[PDB]
Amino acid sequence: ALLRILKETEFKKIKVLGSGAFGTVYKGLWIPEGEKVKIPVAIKELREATSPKANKEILDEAYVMASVDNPHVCRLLGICLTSTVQLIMQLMPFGCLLDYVREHKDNIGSQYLLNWCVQIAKGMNYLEDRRLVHRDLAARNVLVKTPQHVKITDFGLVPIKWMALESILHRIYTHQSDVWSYGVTVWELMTFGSKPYDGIPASEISSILEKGERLPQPPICTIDVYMIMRKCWMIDADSRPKFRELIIEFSKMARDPQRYLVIQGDERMHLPSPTDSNFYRALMDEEDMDDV
Amino acid sequence: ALLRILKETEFKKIKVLGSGAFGTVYKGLWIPEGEKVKIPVAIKELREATSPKANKEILDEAYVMASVDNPHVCRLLGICLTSTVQLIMQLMPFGCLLDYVREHKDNIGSQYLLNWCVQIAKGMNYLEDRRLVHRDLAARNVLVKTPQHVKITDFGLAKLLGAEEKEKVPIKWMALESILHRIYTHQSDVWSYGVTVWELMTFGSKPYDGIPASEISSILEKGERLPQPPICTIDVYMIMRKCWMIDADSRPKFRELIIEFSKMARDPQRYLVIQGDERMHLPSPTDSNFYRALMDEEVD
Numbered sequence: 001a002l003l004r005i006l007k008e009t010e011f012k013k014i015k016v017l018g019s020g021a022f023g024t025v026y027k028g029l030w031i032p033e034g035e036k037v038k039i040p041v042a043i044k045e046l047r048e049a050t051s052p053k054a055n056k057e058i059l060d061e062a063y064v065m066a067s068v069d070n071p072h073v074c075r076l077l078g079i080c081l082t083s084t085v086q087l088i089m090q091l092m093p094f095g096c097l098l099d100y101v102r103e104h105k106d107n108i109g110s111q112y113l114l115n116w117c118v119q120i121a122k123g124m125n126y127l128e129d130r131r132l133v134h135r136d137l138a139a140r141n142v143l144v145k146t147p148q149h150v151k152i153t154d155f156g157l158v159p160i161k162w163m164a165l166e167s168i169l170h171r172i173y174t175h176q177s178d179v180w181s182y183g184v185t186v187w188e189l190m191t192f193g194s195k196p197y198d199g200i201p202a203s204e205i206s207s208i209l210e211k212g213e214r215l216p217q218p219p220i221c222t223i224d225v226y227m228i229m230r231k232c233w234m235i236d237a238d239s240r241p242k243f244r245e246l247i248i249e250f251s252k253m254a255r256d257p258q259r260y261l262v263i264q265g266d267e268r269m270h271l272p273s274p275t276d277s278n279f280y281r282a283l284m285d286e287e288d289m290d291d292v
Numbered sequence: 293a294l295l296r297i298l299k300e301t302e303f304k305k306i307k308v309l310g311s312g313a314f315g316t317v318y319k320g321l322w323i324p325e326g327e328k329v330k331i332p333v334a335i336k337e338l339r340e341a342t343s344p345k346a347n348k349e350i351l352d353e354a355y356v357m358a359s360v361d362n363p364h365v366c367r368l369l370g371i372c373l374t375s376t377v378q379l380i381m382q383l384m385p386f387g388c389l390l391d392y393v394r395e396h397k398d399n400i401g402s403q404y405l406l407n408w409c410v411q412i413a414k415g416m417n418y419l420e421d422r423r424l425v426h427r428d429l430a431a432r433n434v435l436v437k438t439p440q441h442v443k444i445t446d447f448g449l450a451k452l453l454g455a456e457e458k459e460k461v462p463i464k465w466m467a468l469e470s471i472l473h474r475i476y477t478h479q480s481d482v483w484s485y486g487v488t489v490w491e492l493m494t495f496g497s498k499p500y501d502g503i504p505a506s507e508i509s510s511i512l513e514k515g516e517r518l519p520q521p522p523i524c525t526i527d528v529y530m531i532m533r534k535c536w537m538i539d540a541d542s543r544p545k546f547r548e549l550i551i552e553f554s555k556m557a558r559d560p561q562r563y564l565v566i567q568g569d570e571r572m573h574l575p576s577p578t579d580s581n582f583y584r585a586l587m588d589e590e591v592d
């Protein structure tokens with residue numbers, strides 16, 4: 001009952017958002033039957049059609065993705081099993097956090113970055129609590145509902161520069177491997193969208209990791225935050241932090257954001273007032289969540 | 293804190309949506325600072341008010357309109373006080389309930405009709421608990437967020453715009469005390485509530501059609517009211533009549549209309565005789581969960 005079974009004639013793709021990988025992502029419009037309203041949605045299309053009973057196992061997984069109830073994880077709203085599987089979800093009009101942090105290269109205060117790290121861990125801890133592994137966490141796979149509210153997408157289904165060493169050498173994906181990717185994601189945000197291990201061929205990443213070489217300390221990060229990232233990339237998967245621990249740790253820093261992130265001009269980049277925050281929420285973020 | 297002050301440079305009107313005596317509503321675009329995104333909103337540009345009011349006073353009542361917090365009353369979000377008075381609210385693509393029921397005329401089931409009455413009574417009870425009086429409750433002033441969720445709009449717009457010698461004043465909706473002596477209480481809002489139900493039960497009929505508005509006061513003193521809508525059992529029509537009693541204290545309370553319409557909504561076909569009603573049921577949980585995740589994140 002959480003997965004609406006669409007038909008082709010009650011929606012339509014409007015403009016491509018992203019393409020290549022999974023398939024294509026479109027800006028879309030939902031046209032209810034009998035009504036003259038057009039509701040903007042997002043549609044995920046798989047380019048390869050090849051589906052018979054492949055569609056049934058997709059529907060089985062689609063019901064699981066339709067059940068993720070969390071303010072910081074995206075829910076699958078509906079499916080259209082036409083030609084090529086079509087997934088329907090809410091449109092996040094601000095785009096992904098990678099493009100967002102890149103456009104606002106040096107116009108992002110320390111309160112936003114730390115809160116984003118808190119909100120991403122809450123969504124991941126939620127998934128771990130549901131015994132689900134994301135396998136592909138990355139700043140590109142986090143969406144900006146509003147600047148104060150991010151959500152993890154691409155849950156369902158090779159980012160070598162994002163995977164734990166055990167996932168590279170042995171294709172072992174756990175929740176502790178997701179912690180590794182979460183540590184690369186944090187680094188992506190702190191460096192404002194820099195490419196991890198830039199230029200370096202992905203085929204040689206397992207070699208440089210076995211030598212204990214890790215991503216460098218981002219300029220705006222105090223040692224407290226970089227040590228967090230370093231512990232996420234420990235060879236021993238069990239030594240890596242738990243997502244529940246990361247929620248508490250980053251939250252403490254979000255209480256004193258300037259003590260853990262050194263940003264030029266940070267004194268004039270604060271989180272919105274209650275006023276802007278009631279305004280945002282009343283328009284596009286009327287959903288129940290946790291105070292930031 | 294609940295009312296955002298907007299500058300003319302961070303929003304722009306796109307297209308008109310509909311015009312009324314309080315003003316015209318436009319499909320708007322909010323451009324947040326330093327963002328490349330356009331956020332759709334709804335903008336009401338108000339018509340000039342009689343007893344022209346100072347911007348401190350208008351703002352002093354915009355804070356009251358921005359304070360209503362109920363799933364069934366629309367909250368004013370922002371304001372722009374310049375050469376005109378522009379109100380900003382959440383865009384409701386479905387429109388107002390009056391246009392909706394005329395438009396799906398003989399396609400609406402009794403379970404929707406009785407639920408809309410509960411929801412309107414719930415918004416009105418909230419406004420009475422807050423000691424607020426709406427003064428212009430009507431089917432045109434109820435907005436459809438989703439087909440299963442309606443909200444009262446335009447609260448407080450009558451008090452701050454006033455009126456000239458057009459007594460913009462909804463005569464065929466006001467209690468007799470309001471037409472005669474301009475008395476607006478919670479019990480006269482019950483009078484407009486009865487008329488609002490009658491508009492719903494008739495699928496958008498014009499009340500007192502053919503009777504000039506200047507003559508409503510007198511026919512009301514002769515005991516003449518609105519006729520029984522054809523789909524109404526005497527159960528519902530009794531409740532409507534009680535909303536039109538000359539003694540405002542004999543009229544039903546909103547707290548009572550909530551319970552009474554909840555009762556009928558649990559057995560909707562006992563109370564509304566609609567041809568073909570045995571195929572016009574509510575949406576499934578699936579279709580309902582879909583509407584909520586897309587447009588509505590905020591009695592069977």
Ligand SMILES: *CCC(=O)Nc1cc(Nc2nccc(-n3cc(CN(C)C)c(-c4ccccc4)n3)n2)c(OC)cc1N1CCOCC1
Nearest residue numbers: 017018022025042044090091092093094095096140141154
């Ligand atoms: C970072 C890339 C990106 O997503 N940009 C983006 C996002 C959105 N809003 C949006 N709403 C709902 C769903 C999505 N979305 C994106 C993707 C693929 N991304 C994460 C790499 C998926 C997806 C889900 C499941 C499976 C596979 C893919 N869902 N995105 C935009 O709407 C405003 C616009 C943009 N971009 C703006 C500038 O660049 C092009 C589009």
